[PDB]
Every structure is written in structure tokens, then in C-alpha cells.
Amino acid sequence: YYWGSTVTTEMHNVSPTQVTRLPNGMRVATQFSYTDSATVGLWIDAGARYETKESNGTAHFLERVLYLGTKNRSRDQLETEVENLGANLNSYTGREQTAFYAKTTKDGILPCIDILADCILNPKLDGDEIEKERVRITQDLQAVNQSYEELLYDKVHTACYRDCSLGQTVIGPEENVATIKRDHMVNYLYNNFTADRMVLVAVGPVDHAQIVKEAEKKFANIRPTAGPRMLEEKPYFCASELVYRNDDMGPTAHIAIAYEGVPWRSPDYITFMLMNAIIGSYDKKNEGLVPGLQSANRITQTGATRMDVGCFDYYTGFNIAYKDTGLFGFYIATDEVAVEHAVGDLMFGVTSFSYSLTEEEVMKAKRELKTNFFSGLDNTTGVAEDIGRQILAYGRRLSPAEFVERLDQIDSQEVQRVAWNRLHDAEITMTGVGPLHGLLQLWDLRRQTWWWRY
Amino acid sequence: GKSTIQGTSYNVVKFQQEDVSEVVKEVPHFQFYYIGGEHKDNKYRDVPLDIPVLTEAPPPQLKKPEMKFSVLENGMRIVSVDKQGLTSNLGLFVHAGSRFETPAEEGLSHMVECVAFRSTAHLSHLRTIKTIEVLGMNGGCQAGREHIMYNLELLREYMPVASTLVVGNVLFPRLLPWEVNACHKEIKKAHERLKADTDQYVSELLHQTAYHNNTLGNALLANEGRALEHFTGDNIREFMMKHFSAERSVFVGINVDHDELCKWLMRSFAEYVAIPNLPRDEAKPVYTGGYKLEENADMPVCNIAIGFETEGWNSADLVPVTVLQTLLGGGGSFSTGGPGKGMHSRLYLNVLNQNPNVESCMAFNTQYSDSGLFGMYITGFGQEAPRLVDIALNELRKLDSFTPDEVSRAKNTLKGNIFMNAENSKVLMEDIGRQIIMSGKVVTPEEFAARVDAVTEADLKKVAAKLLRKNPTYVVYGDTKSAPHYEYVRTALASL
Amino acid sequence: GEPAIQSIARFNPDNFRPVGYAENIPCPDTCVPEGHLDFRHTRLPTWHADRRPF
Amino acid sequence: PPIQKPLLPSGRAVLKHGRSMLCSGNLSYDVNSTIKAPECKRGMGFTQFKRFTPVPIESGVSVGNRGWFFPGVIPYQGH
Amino acid sequence: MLTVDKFTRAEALQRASNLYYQVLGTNWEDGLNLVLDVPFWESELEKVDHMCEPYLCDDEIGPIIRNLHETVNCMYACEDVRDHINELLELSSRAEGVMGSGAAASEEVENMPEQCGMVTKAYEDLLARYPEHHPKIEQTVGHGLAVLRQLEKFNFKSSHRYFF
Amino acid sequence: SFHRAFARVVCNYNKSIEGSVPWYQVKREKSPFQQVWDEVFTPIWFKLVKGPYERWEYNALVARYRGMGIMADDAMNDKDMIVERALDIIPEDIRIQRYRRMMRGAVLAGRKLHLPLELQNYDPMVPYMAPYIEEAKFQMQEEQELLAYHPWDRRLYTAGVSGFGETSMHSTFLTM
Amino acid sequence: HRPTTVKMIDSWRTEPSSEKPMWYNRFDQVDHISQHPDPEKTEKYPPVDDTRKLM
Numbered sequence A: 001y002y003w004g005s006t007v008t009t010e011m012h013n014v015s016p017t018q019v020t021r022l023p024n025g026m027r028v029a030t031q032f033s034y035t036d037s038a039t040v041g042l043w044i045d046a047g048a049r050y051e052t053k054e055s056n057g058t059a060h061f062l063e064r065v066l067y068l069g070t071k072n073r074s075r076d077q078l079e080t081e082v083e084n085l086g087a088n089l090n091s092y093t094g095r096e097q098t099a100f101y102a103k104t105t106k107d108g109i110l111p112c113i114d115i116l117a118d119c120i121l122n123p124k125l126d127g128d129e130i131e132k133e134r135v136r137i138t139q140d141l142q143a144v145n146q147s148y149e150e151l152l153y154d155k156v157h158t159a160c161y162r163d164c165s166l167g168q169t170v171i172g173p174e175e176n177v178a179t180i181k182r183d184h185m186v187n188y189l190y191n192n193f194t195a196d197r198m199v200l201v202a203v204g205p206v207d208h209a210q211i212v213k214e215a216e217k218k219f220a221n222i223r224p225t226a227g228p229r230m231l232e233e234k235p236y237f238c239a240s241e242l243v244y245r246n247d248d249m250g251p252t253a254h255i256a257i258a259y260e261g262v263p264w265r266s267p268d269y270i271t272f273m274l275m276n277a278i279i280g281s282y283d284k285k286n287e288g289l290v291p292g293l294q295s296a297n298r299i300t301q302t303g304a305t306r307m308d309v310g311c312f313d314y315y316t317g318f319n320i321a322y323k324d325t326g327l328f329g330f331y332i333a334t335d336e337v338a339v340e341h342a343v344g345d346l347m348f349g350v351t352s353f354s355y356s357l358t359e360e361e362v363m364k365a366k367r368e369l370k371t372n373f374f375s376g377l378d379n380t381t382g383v384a385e386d387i388g389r390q391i392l393a394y395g396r397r398l399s400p401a402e403f404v405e406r407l408d409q410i411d412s413q414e415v416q417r418v419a420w421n422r423l424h425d426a427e428i429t430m431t432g433v434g435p436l437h438g439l440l441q442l443w444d445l446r447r448q449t450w451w452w453r454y
Numbered sequence B: 001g002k003s004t005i006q007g008t009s010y011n012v013v014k015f016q017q018e019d020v021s022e023v024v025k026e027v028p029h030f031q032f033y034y035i036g037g038e039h040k041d042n043k044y045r046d047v048p049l050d051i052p053v054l055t056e057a058p059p060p061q062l063k064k065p066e067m068k069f070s071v072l073e074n075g076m077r078i079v080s081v082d083k084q085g086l087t088s089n090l091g092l093f094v095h096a097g098s099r100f101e102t103p104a105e106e107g108l109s110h111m112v113e114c115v116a117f118r119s120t121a122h123l124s125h126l127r128t129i130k131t132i133e134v135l136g137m138n139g140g141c142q143a144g145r146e147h148i149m150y151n152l153e154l155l156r157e158y159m160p161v162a163s164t165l166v167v168g169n170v171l172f173p174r175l176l177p178w179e180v181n182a183c184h185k186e187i188k189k190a191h192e193r194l195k196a197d198t199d200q201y202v203s204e205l206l207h208q209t210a211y212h213n214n215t216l217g218n219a220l221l222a223n224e225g226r227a228l229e230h231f232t233g234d235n236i237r238e239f240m241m242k243h244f245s246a247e248r249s250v251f252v253g254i255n256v257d258h259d260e261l262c263k264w265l266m267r268s269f270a271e272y273v274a275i276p277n278l279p280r281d282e283a284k285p286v287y288t289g290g291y292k293l294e295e296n297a298d299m300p301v302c303n304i305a306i307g308f309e310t311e312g313w314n315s316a317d318l319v320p321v322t323v324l325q326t327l328l329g330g331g332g333s334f335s336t337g338g339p340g341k342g343m344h345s346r347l348y349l350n351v352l353n354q355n356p357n358v359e360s361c362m363a364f365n366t367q368y369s370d371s372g373l374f375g376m377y378i379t380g381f382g383q384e385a386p387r388l389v390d391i392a393l394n395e396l397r398k399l400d401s402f403t404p405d406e407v408s409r410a411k412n413t414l415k416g417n418i419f420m421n422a423e424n425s426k427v428l429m430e431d432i433g434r435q436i437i438m439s440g441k442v443v444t445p446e447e448f449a450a451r452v453d454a455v456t457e458a459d460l461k462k463v464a465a466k467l468l469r470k471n472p473t474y475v476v477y478g479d480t481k482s483a484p485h486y487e488y489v490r491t492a493l494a495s496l
Numbered sequence C: 001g002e003p004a005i006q007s008i009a010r011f012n013p014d015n016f017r018p019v020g021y022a023e024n025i026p027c028p029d030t031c032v033p034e035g036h037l038d039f040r041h042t043r044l045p046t047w048h049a050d051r052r053p054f
Numbered sequence D: 001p002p003i004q005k006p007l008l009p010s011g012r013a014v015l016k017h018g019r020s021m022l023c024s025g026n027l028s029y030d031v032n033s034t035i036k037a038p039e040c041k042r043g044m045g046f047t048q049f050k051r052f053t054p055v056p057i058e059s060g061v062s063v064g065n066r067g068w069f070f071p072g073v074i075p076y077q078g079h
Numbered sequence E: 001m002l003t004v005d006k007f008t009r010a011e012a013l014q015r016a017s018n019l020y021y022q023v024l025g026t027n028w029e030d031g032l033n034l035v036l037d038v039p040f041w042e043s044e045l046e047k048v049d050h051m052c053e054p055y056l057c058d059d060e061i062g063p064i065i066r067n068l069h070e071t072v073n074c075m076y077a078c079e080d081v082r083d084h085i086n087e088l089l090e091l092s093s094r095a096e097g098v099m100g101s102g103a104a105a106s107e108e109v110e111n112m113p114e115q116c117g118m119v120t121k122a123y124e125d126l127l128a129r130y131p132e133h134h135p136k137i138e139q140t141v142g143h144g145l146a147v148l149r150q151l152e153k154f155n156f157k158s159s160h161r162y163f164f
Numbered sequence F: 001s002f003h004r005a006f007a008r009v010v011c012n013y014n015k016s017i018e019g020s021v022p023w024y025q026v027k028r029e030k031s032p033f034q035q036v037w038d039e040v041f042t043p044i045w046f047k048l049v050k051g052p053y054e055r056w057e058y059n060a061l062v063a064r065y066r067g068m069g070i071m072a073d074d075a076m077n078d079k080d081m082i083v084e085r086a087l088d089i090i091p092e093d094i095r096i097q098r099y100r101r102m103m104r105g106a107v108l109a110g111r112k113l114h115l116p117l118e119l120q121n122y123d124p125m126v127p128y129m130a131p132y133i134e135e136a137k138f139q140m141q142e143e144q145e146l147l148a149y150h151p152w153d154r155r156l157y158t159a160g161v162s163g164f165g166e167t168s169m170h171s172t173f174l175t176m
Numbered sequence G: 001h002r003p004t005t006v007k008m009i010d011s012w013r014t015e016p017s018s019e020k021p022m023w024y025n026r027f028d029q030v031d032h033i034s035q036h037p038d039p040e041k042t043e044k045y046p047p048v049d050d051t052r053k054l055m
């Protein structure tokens, strides 16, 4: 039901994001902010998904060696120069997107553009640096050196996307890590780090014209384009199970259950964001001002009552989106004996969206969704991530006002329609690590996606 | 400016009598129940997100943020900045921490935190927390050594409600016997949350050893044995009457209109009498130094900390000692930091790069109104403790001189840290509130940058010499079966 | 003129008692009032014969 | 748009006891910082599943006691 | 959309391109063309959207979907203005009376000079909003305004290109 | 859809009665007809039936309480949930004397005896529980309004509870 | 608690307690619970010898 518009005057009072396309095809996006610090970086449309099976892991390796010296600097000189500017260089690598962003002061904006351009365009992939990083990457590759939340994040993709490259991990298999060489990385740079796939984001005390001029000068020699990516069909969602039963790792079990989600540009994506908010998160060790027994979240409240002890030591919803697919589900960390109750309750919660979801819960979720999104845009790095991630995902940045406008239209009935179409009687994928005697078969859990009542 | 309070000028907001009927008209609209509704299909159900749908947007109105200072007639100071964000951060700071407790009042500051957001004169406990929840607000209360903070993060539109709820914790709290008894659980949770953070636990050990049974040393958390005898509503009320007063309180608001915040805060205190301000015993900290070796049977690693007394926040040594902390910097093997992340600090280059057995080495600089602690924190395997202490002592002996390149790098990194930390709104709120409580004044990030630029090598040498003349505080936590004795540390530092 | 915290404290439900409470509520010292039969009166004389056999 | 924070807000103070915005280091990458951007040792994305609550999990710790039992007492058939 | 049917990207591309040219080829000026066809177009458009959701970023399917959405927007907008013009002309015809005699004549629009200023503004707004659909805008709204011009002498930018 | 219309009717009818004064807070003048009724019937009915009957019952009730040695508020059964929630928060002094009186009353009633007259000169209708009954009702009304405004859906017959609302395990026949 | 119900409803014919208390609404208020008179150490009403003299 429609209860009015929550857009306010303050939402319109934000500096505009100016996006211009350079002649080579590189987009330059900037937003001015009244700050003494800035964030300037390069958000690229590269990642593990766009690697082949034999080369999986090259992108992650390159990201770890790109700041270890250039053809015009050395590692010590580069690190010294950044420190003198009072700046720090960051970088991450994902399945579909990558970034290389610097957090500096106002006077270091243009100087940092020069540093980042040199690293991206003229990386000196010294053999010694590669070999040392090979050891570090290999140690990280060991699952003993990986958290259980990182392990289940990767295994969810492995189980759900057996047929496509989205199932590949970022770090890569140990066989590939053992064999990556400079030539692999040089090829990856040539094919993927091209102007058409890069966005230069500058947030802070910045002027669009000046940033654009510097960008054109420093990125003049970048490869203009690479061949269009091979057209593929929708990533097939495999309803499978990948459970690592281990009764020798303590009492806590980690279970992740996934449904097929929606791509970034889907009209239903904001509905899935709201549904993710309704699921929410809960930790027995950080319950908040409201206790679990008296929580407005229905999943949390019913869970907190089970056996007078609570069946969720921790849980969170997740909504992962890619260009042509997505994953929607929940992650649980709970006592071994509580797993059956925990998965049963969260699946009952997701199934409830399709039958009996109250306006009260939706409206609370809208406010906490907006309180999480807006607070993320507080600092320059948060804004820069939002600009770079949103231009890659959508080709434009959605304004806070537009997000609120579209969220106003979504109500309990809209959530019910989307859930009924996509989540009710739907195929699921379960992945887990730990003592999981209580975890039932996939078919048993999949029947809990529909109700005999109502 | 109509009033000067502790070195800062405030504009005086006058109390006005308004009818409940007229103020109700200005309260933000919200519903708890939705009994029916007007169906309206999602108009954008078929519109992909890549297609803009909003048209005729009002032109933006950008104003350079400025910090504005006001004071009510009851003596409550209000300090607000508006960065024009869409989420606000309202906080209430009271100058009543653990340092003001008498030995018979042990833990009472923590107890006040535990009973926060319980029943008030005009709102039950359940109704306060369900309102904060339905409006999508997060927050809580934290009791420190010098102050206690009540914070709520909210969508700016709901500030009128949040201001009321926060202020009710200090204005008319009903410390009902059976609601207080339900808060005894939080003590055990607090101890577990502290001990989980090894760095903060070792910091608590440092302060207790540094200042023996006095102000800063006073335990931050209440114990769950003999302290529960006076964990009562009556005892809490007496403590609040002694220390909680409008003159010792400061309401900070980030991303809020100052005039609106002042109005609603005025309306909240207009028809009620705040706790009167009374004199209290305020004794300067007594630094004794000393040593404590705490054993954690489950930990195989040894955490060693050697600290020294600093004059504190109100001294002229504050900025120079902070440059010294950045100059010595430090890092940890667990972290893999890229360029500009402390890879060229003295500790990283002299300790981490040259001693593979050192798990982590860092410099620490706690700062309080009239005292502080500076020193090094180094960790490693238990059997390595004798060598870890030697490494720490050797670094302390190198503070006699500093190269020009190191000083410049430290100053630039410190300025970058100041500006980058400031942009976080929660950090800014806590910085402002803790500044006013400590000093009665706010030093802006730019002004601190100006001070940092004026630090010379002579200042660093002078400050370091003063620190090294103090009796060291020597804390070992974890596997302590191989650590040196305190006299070994003392004799090594006796030369300095 | 009282501080609000002090004013609301006086209205704890424990601070209200009915008028004449202390002068009317029975405060019993036993469940067997004086003049009522109990084991002291019903005990057999110490010279009694065994009552188990019967 | 992307969500950059966990669904469970921390609700705690960012700055540590006695540490200020001047002496907390750089909160973006300092080890003791409570808001340090996590490490991409194995790639980006795992933060959507990560538990950001610092206190380690105590399996089976009770949170559903309405005041019906004392600590250490085992309920029998819920009574 | 609630469906169990599965389609390849090639099939999705074919369906979307078929609908796009079907809409863009149909004569919008004839009202019965839109009244009869739009129900079938809306059923198809829902199916096309469901099967093309994965391919919104595709280099071939994506542009087809974007053009298809734009064409439907222009189709609804143009139909609205010409519907009002048809209302104005039918009010004028009824005012003529039975047999043109005036015998049983309806009352004649009084703000006709102002109703023609409203339509012409709408026509220009459509031209700006839908710059890549001018041929369709002129077929429906442009010709409609030319018919109105024969009744009331008013000025619009393209009046000379309509022989006025 | 006819349900969507009914939802608008309900929404609009409730929006039009928000803030209405309860029937008992309206200054009400009795109808002239009621006034005539209250001047003919009520007086005579009280003098001949109500008055005598209700004094006969009330005096007997006071005597029964005095015989048991208990107060009127002692007689409340804790199977009532408002009474239970009030008894949680009574002070120990009141609680101790309340238990002893109830124990003596049950002993006397079971043994078919009565309190000695020497101990019977007290007022049994002193409302010592009133403050705590009112507090308990307030607490329950908050929980009702803020936590029980909808017939919630829960997984049925799990964790020892039916899922239909009760919070104690093994508290129904079907939950054994 | 077992399946239970309380008649916590807005009556159409009976007023709430806040409007019409049914108890004898005269209470003594103190600043602290300790200031109440002690029942055990308080003299009670004098004993009577006839049931028709009971107060």
C-alpha cells in the first residue's frame, strides 16, 4: 500500500556527479565535496570472471604486484613518494570489477593521478617481486589460512555456477598460482586494462575540468579498446550442495543457502535490496538496543525464542549482483545442534515474503536500508566506491533522491509479487563447513520454500 | 556570542513556553501501525535501473559547513556541524567517567552505561527501544575514563524524536529497581568484549598499572562480585546527582541544522529542572609506573608494552608527541599494507624488516585532559620475550636524534591522517565532544595541521627526553613465562 | 523547583502504600494459632505401647 | 546501488578509549581501527558474509531467557 | 514475471527485435491499430522483459531493449495528444449540427484558441523528449495539428511545413 | 479486486477517528428518560433488593476473610497473568507477610478451623497490591501494543512449541 | 507461559481503572521505601470480644 513520498529537500542538496567520456573512451567522473581529503582512483571492468580456466589467478597476482615498482620508479621510491604526499594507495580485485584508488590530501590529487597512471600503464613486473608474492599468495590460498566466511563465499559461487566462469575464485587454484609468470600478467594488462573499461573517479576538493585535463594527459597512451567480450547465455544456476563436514573444528557450523537473484540492471534489484534488508542480520554478541526476544525482525524474534536459548549465534542476508545474474540468500553461524532450527527459520522467513509480510516490517526495513546506504556515502572513499561501482554496474550514478523515489513505490505487495515469481517454490543451493549432522538433504530444505497453510 | 564558557563563546538560546498543541504540529510524521492502505502498483516495475526516471529535480543548495556553538539557559552546550549528509549523528557527552569514582563507588560509571535507554518519566523502556528501531536508528552508550557518551545515528528527518530520547536518559531517568536488576547481565558481557580485543585489554592493564588506584587507573568496567551490592537504582541516582549536570554536558550534532537542533533541545529542557551543578573532588592523576604480568593460558603469544607518562591533551607537547608516534609508526606482519601505509616508519624499518621473530611492533599515544601514556607495543612468541624487550629498549634509546627526512615524512603522514579521519562523521562527533569535555575548546583539523607544520626536531628531542625520565610502566600479557623482570627494564632505561 | 530525576523517583510503585497498612495487615507468627490442636497435644504418653503392630 | 556496510550496525564508538582523531593513526588501515577497510587477501566480496562483531562466538550462549531460569540451571521440558 | 518457460539468448534477441519493428512499423495514427494491438504488445513486452533481463548489458540485445522501451514510451505519449485532438475535432463537428445544418448542434468549444496552444506545446515537448521518433510524432500529432489548423488559425513552428 | 477496496475503506474509517476521546472521558449528561428512571426505580430497588442483598454478601465476604486471617488481595489467584506479573515486582516485606497469611489461611481452612477472634479486628479490604497491579498492566499493555499487534506466522510444532503463540515448551497436549 | 489470554480490551460499557478506581483510593506516599512504617513493629487496632464490635 502507498503511504506517500519520503523524498526530502535535503536529498536534492548534493553536489552533482559530472561524468565525461574522453576521446579514447575512458569515462571521468567527479563529485565535489567540502573536504580537505580526496579519493582518486581507477575503477576497471575487469575481474576473475573474465579470465580463462588456465589463467585464473592472474588478475589477483597482478593487483598484488602493480604497486611494487614501475618502469619509471622503484618500489622504495614509489612508497617514499606516496608517503611524502601524505597519501595511501589501495586496490582490490573481484570477479567482475577491480579498483586502484588513492586516498590523499587536496594537494596530492593530481600527483596521485600520475602515480596511478604509471602503475597501471607501465608496471615493472620484476621476477623477484613475483616470486615473493607467489609465496604469500600460496600461503593465503591454503584454506587453513582462510576464514570460514571467506570459504563459504567462494564455495557458494563454485556450487551455483558450475558451468560458467563466475564459479572461478579470485585467488585461483594452486596449480595456476604455481605457474603464473610475467607474460601472463602482461597479457592480462594488455587485454583487460583498456580505456573503454576504465573509469577515473575523483571525489573531494576537485574541479572536473582540471581532472579531465590531467586524465587525458596521463592516460594518452592507454590502449583505446579491446575486442568485445564473447556473448554468452545467462549463467545457469545449479541447485547443488557443497558441504564440508568436519567434526574436528569446534562446535560452530557455518551454513550458506542461496537462491537465484537478479542482475544489477534488473527492475527488481531494489526489491531484492529491500528483501535483503528485511532479513537483516543478528549477532548474539552484539544485539543492539532491542533484544532478540523483542525484535521487530520476525526471523530474529522467532529465532531468539527457540529452546529458550536462541538458534542463531550469527546470521546475515546477502544480495550479490552481477551483470547477468545474482545470488540472494542468507549466511548462518550457529551451534551444531541448532542448525536444523536455524536454516528452517530463515527459509520460513524468506518463504513468508511470498505469503504474509506486514507493512510495518517493510517500512522499518526501508528506513534501515536508507540509513545504511546514506551513511556509506559519508566519506570520500565511500562516495568514490559508490560512483565507480555504480557507473560500472549501470553506466550512471543513481542519485539518493532517485533511489528513494523508486523505493517509495516498493511496498509489501510488490515484495510479495517478486518473491512469488522468483523465490517461492524455487531451487536453492546449500553450502556449509563444520559439524553439520543436523543439515538435511538439499531436497528436504527446498520443500521449505513453500507452505501448506495459506 | 552572548556567553563565554571555559574559553569558548556560545550564543545563548532562551527558553520559551509553547503549547503542546502547537509543537505537535512540527513533530516528524511517522506511523507504527498501518491498518489498511491504498493499493498502487509499482510504476517502475518494468523500468530497468540503467534508465533514469526522475525529472525536474530542484537545483542543489550547497553551503560550506561551519561549526556553530550555542548554550541553553540551563548551561547545556550545543555544538553542531552540517556537512549536508542525509544521516545525522547526535551525541550527548557528560563529564562523568570512571576517574571520578571513589573506591566505594567502583564501577558506577559503567553501571550508568548499562542502564541507558531504560524507562524515563514519559516513556517506558520497551517504547524507547521500539521507537529507535522502527525509525531505523542505531546507537548506544559508552562509558569512558573521563566521559560517558550517548549516541544515536539516524535519518536527519527524525532528529526531533532522537534528541528527546537521548536527553531523557539524563533528565528524568526512572531507575526502577526491577529494570536495573535486569542490567546485571551486561557486566559479564562487557568483560568478554574487552578481553576479546587484546590491544584494548593490554591498554586497560597499562592504565591500571601506570596510575595505581587513582583517577585514570580506576577500572573502566564494574566487577560482578562485590560491586553488585551497590548496583542499584538508588546508588546510580546518587552518582548521577553528584556528576551529571547540564553544566558538565555537551550535545554534539553532525549533519543537523543547528537552529532546529537548538529549538528541539530547548523544548526538551524548558518545562523541567536539570540536575543542579555541584562542586566535586577533581584530583590530578598520580603516575606511579610499575609492572603487571597477566597470564592467558590459552595464548601462546607474548604481548609486551612499555609506557611512559605524558602531560596530556591540554599541554603544548600534544602535537609534538603525536608526530613522534607517527615517526616511530609501526606495523604488523598480519597486515600487508601498500604504499603510504607505514611501510617506512622507523619501527617497520628497524624492527619488522630486521627481526622475523617479531610478530608486531607499534607505538601508542593515549591522551586525556591532564595526563597520558606514550610507549611501544611489541608482540611475538613466548620464548622470544627476552629478545622482544631488548628490541623495544633499543628503539627507546634511539629517540635522541631524528633525521630531517623522517621528520618531514612523519609530519606529512600525520596531516594526512588528521584530514582523512576527520571526514568520518562519527569520528568527528566523538572528537568534538571529547575535545570540549577535556578542554572546553575545539581545535579544527586545519588548525591541528598548522601546529603539525611547526614541529621541529628540537621539539621531538625535548618531548622524548621528558618521557624517558618517567618511571616506566611494563605490562606483559599472554605467555609471560620468559619475560624479563621489571628491574631489567628499569635499569636499561635508567641511563636515559 | 525539584530536579526532575528526584521528582519521578518519588513515584516508584514502592513509595505508595495504602493508608492504615501497618495498622491493619495481619502479620502471622504461626499457622497454628493459640488454642488450636497440634502435635504437642496429640502426642501419646511416653509409656504408650507400640502402635506399629495394630 | 551497492551496500558498503553490514546489515547489523555496530552501534559502538569508533575511536578507542583514550585515542583521539589526532592520535588514532590512520583509521582507514590501522590495525586497531574499528573501521579499517578489510583486506582482500583472497579477493573482494566476502565482506557481505563477514561477521564484523569483534567478540568471538560462544556457541549456544543463551539469549532466549525471559527471566525464567538462573544461570547454570538446565530447563527440563521447558520448566 | 511468473513463468517456467526458458529461452536462449538468440531466441530472446529474436523476440525483442520482432516486437520492436512490429511497434515501429504499425501505423500509430489509426486509433484502431493501437487499441487492438496494444493488448498483444503488452503481453509480449512482459515476456520479452523477463527473458531479456540477463542480457540488459549485452551488446546486441541491450540496445534492442532500450529502443523498444523508447518506442513504447513514444507510442503512449503521442497517442495521448492525438486522442485529445480527436476530442477537439469531434466537439467541433458536433457543433456543426445534424447534416451540417446546425439543426441539433452542440455548443462550440470556447477556449479553442487556448486548447490549440496547449496541444502545440505538447507536440513540441514530444519532439524534444523523443528526438529519434520524429517520423512517428509527425504522422500522429503533427498531422493532427494540421487538421486543427484548418478550423482555427493558430501558429506553430512547423505550420509552414504543413502548407499553412 | 474487492479486497483492495475494503482495505481503503478500513484505512479511511480509522484515519477519521484518530485522536477521538474515549466514551468515558466525555462529559455526559444523562438522557431525560434515564433521569426519570434513576429517580423512581434506582432508589426503591436499592432500598429493597440491591442494597440489602449486596450488604449481605459483602459482610459475609469480610467475615470469611477475617476467619482465614487473610486480606482481600491475598485471595487473588496467580493463574491470572496480571497477578503473576505484579507478584514479580512486589517488595520482599509485602511478599513475606503475604505468604505467611496465605499459609495460615490454608491450614485453618483445611483443618476446618477459624482464626481466633483476638486476631480478627482488622480491615481486610486494604488494597496493598494496587500499585503493582497498575504497573503490571502498564507493562503488559506496552508489550501488547508494541509486540503483538498482528497474528504472527511461525514454523509450527518446532522447538517444543506449537508455533501458534505460546512461549513455554511442552505446555499443550499436542506439544506433550 | 502456557497458551493464555487476558481480557485486556477497550470495553464499551465498563470504564478503565484510571478513570474509576474500584479500590479505596487513599494512599500514603514516601520519598523512599524505608520510610514506610514497619507493620511488625506497629501497634494494631485493639482486640474486641464480640463480633459486633469488629471495626
Ligand SMILES: CCCCCCCCCCCCCCCCCC(=O)OC[C@H](COP(=O)([O-])OCC(O)COP(=O)([O-])OC[C@@H](COC(=O)CCCCCCCCCCCCCCCCC)OC(=O)CCCCCCCCCCCCCCCCC)OC(=O)CCCCCCCCCCCCCCCCC
Pocket: G007, G009, G010, G011, G012, G013, G014
Ligand atoms: C426465556 C428467556 C429467553 C431469553 C432469550 C434471550 C437472552 C439473551 C441474553 C444475552 C443478551 C442480553 C442482551 C444483550 C444486549 C446487547 C449486548 C451487546 O451488544 O453486547 C456488547 C457488549 C460488549 O461490551 P464489553 O463490556 O466490551 O464486553 C466485554 C466482553 O469481555 C467481551 O469480550 P471480548 O472483547 O473478547 O469480545 C468477545 C465477543 C464474542 O462475540 C462473539 O463471539 C461474536 C459472534 C457471536 C455473537 C454475535 C453474532 C451471533 C449470531 C447473530 C445472527 C447471525 C445470522 C447470520 C445469517 C446469515 C444469512 C446468510 O463479544 C463481544 O465483543 C461482545 C458481544 C458478546 C456476544 C453477544 C452479542 C450479541 C448479543 C445478543 C445475544 C442474542 C440475543 C437473542 C435475543 C432473542 C430474542 C429474545 O457485551 C456485553 O455487554 C457482554 C456480553 C453480554 C452477552 C453475553 C452473551 C453470552 C452468549 C449467549 C447469548 C445468548 C444467551 C441466551 C440464549 C437462550 C436460548 C439458547
Ligand SMILES: COC1=C(OC)C(=O)C(CC=C(C)C)=C(C)C1=O
Pocket: E097, E098, E099, E100
Ligand atoms: C455533415 O453531416 C454528417 C456527417 O459529417 C461529415 C457525417 O459523417 C455523415 C455520414 C454518416 C453516415 C452514418 C452515413 C452524415 C450523414 C452527416 O450528416
